[PDB]
Each structure stands twice: as structure tokens, then as C-alpha cells.
Design an enzyme around this catalytic site. Sequence first.
Site, PDB file in Angstrom:
ATOM      1  N   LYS A 262       4.212  -2.948   8.796  1.00 23.76           N
ATOM      2  CA  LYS A 262       5.314  -2.051   8.344  1.00 23.76           C
ATOM      3  C   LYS A 262       6.603  -2.779   8.427  1.00 23.76           C
ATOM      4  O   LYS A 262       6.783  -3.088   9.696  1.00 23.76           O
ATOM      5  CB  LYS A 262       5.137  -0.687   8.765  1.00 23.76           C
ATOM      6  CG  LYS A 262       6.230   0.314   8.525  1.00 23.76           C
ATOM      7  CD  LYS A 262       6.167   1.626   8.922  1.00 23.76           C
ATOM      8  CE  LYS A 262       6.460   1.749  10.495  1.00 23.76           C
ATOM      9  NZ  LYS A 262       6.084   3.301  10.982  1.00 23.76           N
TER      10      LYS A 262
ATOM     11  N   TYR B 121      10.794   5.645   5.834  1.00 22.74           N
ATOM     12  CA  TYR B 121      11.221   4.789   7.221  1.00 22.74           C
ATOM     13  C   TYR B 121      10.788   3.606   7.034  1.00 22.74           C
ATOM     14  O   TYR B 121      11.257   2.604   7.718  1.00 22.74           O
ATOM     15  CB  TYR B 121      10.509   5.284   8.322  1.00 22.74           C
ATOM     16  N   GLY B 122       9.994   3.102   5.735  1.00 20.57           N
ATOM     17  CA  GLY B 122       9.773   1.769   5.689  1.00 20.57           C
ATOM     18  C   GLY B 122       8.719   1.669   4.592  1.00 20.57           C
ATOM     19  O   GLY B 122       8.413   2.660   3.758  1.00 20.57           O
TER      20      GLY B 122
ATOM     21  N   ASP C  98       0.813   8.546  13.821  1.00 19.23           N
ATOM     22  CA  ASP C  98       1.949   9.106  13.169  1.00 19.23           C
ATOM     23  C   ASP C  98       2.519  10.344  14.007  1.00 19.23           C
ATOM     24  O   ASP C  98       2.595  11.427  13.736  1.00 19.23           O
ATOM     25  CB  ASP C  98       1.766   9.618  11.777  1.00 19.23           C
ATOM     26  CG  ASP C  98       1.555   8.609  10.660  1.00 19.23           C
ATOM     27  OD1 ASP C  98       1.687   7.448  10.984  1.00 19.23           O
ATOM     28  OD2 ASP C  98       1.515   8.936   9.450  1.00 19.23           O
TER      29      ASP C  98
ATOM     30  N   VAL D  62       0.928  -1.390  -0.008  1.00 20.05           N
ATOM     31  CA  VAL D  62      -0.040   0.077  -0.006  1.00 20.05           C
ATOM     32  C   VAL D  62       0.990   1.251   0.063  1.00 20.05           C
ATOM     33  O   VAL D  62       0.344   2.332  -0.208  1.00 20.05           O
ATOM     34  CB  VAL D  62      -0.980   0.113   1.195  1.00 20.05           C
ATOM     35  CG1 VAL D  62      -2.053  -1.031   0.979  1.00 20.05           C
ATOM     36  CG2 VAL D  62      -0.432  -0.248   2.455  1.00 20.05           C
ATOM     37  N   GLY D  63       2.059   1.353   0.366  1.00 18.94           N
ATOM     38  CA  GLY D  63       2.869   2.227   0.343  1.00 18.94           C
ATOM     39  C   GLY D  63       4.254   2.237   0.853  1.00 18.94           C
ATOM     40  O   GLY D  63       4.597   0.970   1.427  1.00 18.94           O
ATOM     41  N   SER D  64       5.233   3.295   0.675  1.00 16.86           N
ATOM     42  CA  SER D  64       6.576   3.353   1.162  1.00 16.86           C
ATOM     43  C   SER D  64       6.997   4.423   1.146  1.00 16.86           C
ATOM     44  O   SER D  64       7.222   5.258   0.264  1.00 16.86           O
ATOM     45  CB  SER D  64       7.474   2.117   0.173  1.00 16.86           C
ATOM     46  OG  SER D  64       6.887   2.588  -1.190  1.00 16.86           O
ATOM     47  N   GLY D  65       7.407   4.833   2.626  1.00 17.84           N
ATOM     48  CA  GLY D  65       8.018   6.440   2.740  1.00 17.84           C
ATOM     49  C   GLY D  65       9.390   6.181   2.755  1.00 17.84           C
ATOM     50  O   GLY D  65       9.992   5.116   2.244  1.00 17.84           O
TER      51      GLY D  65
HETATM   52 MG   LIG Z   1       1.170  10.572   8.473  1.00 14.09          MG
END
Ligand SMILES: [Mg+2]
Length: 348
Positions: free
Chosen positions: A50, A32-33, A165, A27-30
Site C-alpha cells: 500500500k 487513504y492510498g 483494518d 488491486v484497489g485504491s481507497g
Molecule cells: Mg475494510
Amino acid sequence: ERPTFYRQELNKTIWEVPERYQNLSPVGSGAYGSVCAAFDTKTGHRVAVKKLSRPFQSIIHAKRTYRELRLLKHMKHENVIGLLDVFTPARSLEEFNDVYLVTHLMGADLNNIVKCQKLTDDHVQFLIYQILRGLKYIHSADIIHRDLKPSNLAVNEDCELKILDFGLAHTDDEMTGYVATRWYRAPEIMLNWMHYNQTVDIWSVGCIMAELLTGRTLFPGTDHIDQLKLILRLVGTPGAELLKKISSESARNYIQSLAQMPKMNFANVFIGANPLAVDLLEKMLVLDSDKRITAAQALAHAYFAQYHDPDDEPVADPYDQSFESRDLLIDEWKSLTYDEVISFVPPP
Ligand SMILES: [Mg+2]
Ligand SMILES: Nc1ccc(Nc2ccccc2)cc1
Ligand SMILES: [Cl-]
Ligand SMILES: [Cl-]
Ligand SMILES: [Cl-]
Ligand SMILES: [Cl-]
């Protein structure tokens, strides 16, 4: 007894997880992980898993991994995200390299709600009440969130809300220009003229509440200085009382260059709003942070009369943050993190 793990490659990343987690989908990846949605067969919940990226690559990163795990393990409140599980495939400290965190999968955020839905005054009451209920809990543990904004607030179909967050200490470029990452930050920290304290979170709540009432960002500045000018036009330039308290030579020299401005009439800014909502906004959006209303005081304001229950607004267990002033080596932060992984006890 250790569960059995299975391996799979998803979008060029190896995921090694206990068999209980099925149907993994990215679903996503920033920075930090990376995150996958999954079905947890032990609890029946849809979850977010995560995998931390490079958790122990430097002292700063290793300490940040420990900080995040300590915070998530402590939070146990209806209006705050909690930890469902934490795991590593490593069988000993010597092979320990990867950390995975598991939380309830969140759908819509408050950004989606303000852009898309017509909100009644009753909706604003209930949403802001829940933010303040969670913040009373967070602040009672001497934690500062530091990054409250609509994308960090999850909301479901029943209008129930959770705070997400936490600020783990955002780069300078991330705060530059016409960016939502800065629009909710208190003036005294936007240029670091004061050290963080819990009153900065109440400023953010005021900015969020204003946006729910009007449908529009309160202080959408194009840069730090433009945003300060928008703020001072609404709340006034610093008076003699607050000026005496300013301990930043950088703040004083710039602020003295601006023509003085009085605080505006909030009933003429928030046209048509409940007078009790206007009163509460005036008590949150105060330039002098010493004088802002606290979360515990705000829960007793008449705007929340239909939801306030002082027997159902709990505080937190004490939270030991002494590690923050400690200086350790990478492998020492890594060992502390390993201990916290293996000692985790899941919720009921
Ligand atoms: Mg956020
Ligand atoms: N030490 C200290 C105290 C208050 C403030 N706040 C402030 C200053 C100028 C403009 C807007 C807010 C900053 C530093
Ligand atoms: Cl399992
Ligand atoms: Cl590992
Ligand atoms: Cl946002
Ligand atoms: Cl503790």
C-alpha cells in the site's frame, strides 16, 4: 545497507519499491492510498503493498499516518494482521515524502463466506473463537478496534481468521442510510451519546455471530433511528438501572419519547441454534455496556469447550498511546514517522 529501488507507472501512479518486490499488479485504491499485489522474493509470500496518499498534507493527516504505523508495528498475534515491511525511497528526512506498507495478501473475507457457504455449528464455534482470541490480545494493549464487521475479517480455506483494518478515526456521509458501515456499531456510539470504550467491540462480535447463525444481517437499519428501533425491539428499552447511568441529555430526551419494550426471547429469534450459542449471544448483546461479557470471559464460555486453551491465548506487550494527547507541527509528526520507518525490524 539500503536496497536498490526501481520505478514503474501503474494506473497513472508512480511506484518506487525495492527489487525484492516483483510482479506488481493493482488491486484497489481507497481515499487513504492505492494497493498492489506482489511477490516478495525474500520471504516467498504473496503480499499487499500500500502506497499512502498524501500522508503529510495536514496535521490531521500526518498524525493519522503516525497512528497507523505505530499500530501496525505493535500487532504480533496469529489472529491479527501484522506488518511484514515498511519502506520509503527517500535517502534522508529532508527528501522524505512517501510511505509504503507491506502485509500478507488476503483472499476471501467473512462476507464471502456467509453469503456463499453452508456453515455448521462447528464452523461458527471456530470462527468466533478466533475473533475473541485476537480481541483479547488487542484489548490487553488498551486498543479499541472500533470497526469490526465481516469485510474486515480475512478467512482462508482452512477456516483460519485474521482481524484487519483497525479504525483510525469514517465520515458522516459514510454512515448515512442503508449501509453495512453502520449495521455492526453499538447503540451508545451510533449517535455519539457515549465515549468509545472496548465494550463496543463485543457488541460488533454479537452482530457478526448472529449473522453466521442465520445467514442474515441482525440490524439492517435504513438510517440511524430505524436501526435504534430494531435494536431496542430485540434487547428492550433502557431500564431504571441503565437510565440512571445515562449522561447524555440528547439520549435521555429522545429515549423518553418511545414506548417501553421488554427484551425478546432469543430462543424464538435464533430458531434451531445451539442453546450454548444463544446463551453467549444474550451475554454479548446487552444494552448496558458495563454488563456485557468481555473477550477474556467469553473465551471460557462452554460454547468454545473444544477450542479453548488458556495456555495458548496470549496477551500483548504494553502499548504507549501518549502521543494521542500531544500537539505537534506537521514536520514534527513527519520526523516521528521517519524514525519509525528506519527502526523497523522484520519478523523472523
Ligand atoms: Mg475494510
Ligand atoms: N451515557 C450513556 C449511557 C448509556 C447509553 N446507551 C443507550 C442510551 C439510549 C439508547 C440506547 C443505548 C448512552 C449514553
Ligand atoms: Cl531488494
Ligand atoms: Cl519519499
Ligand atoms: Cl461488512
Ligand atoms: Cl509502546
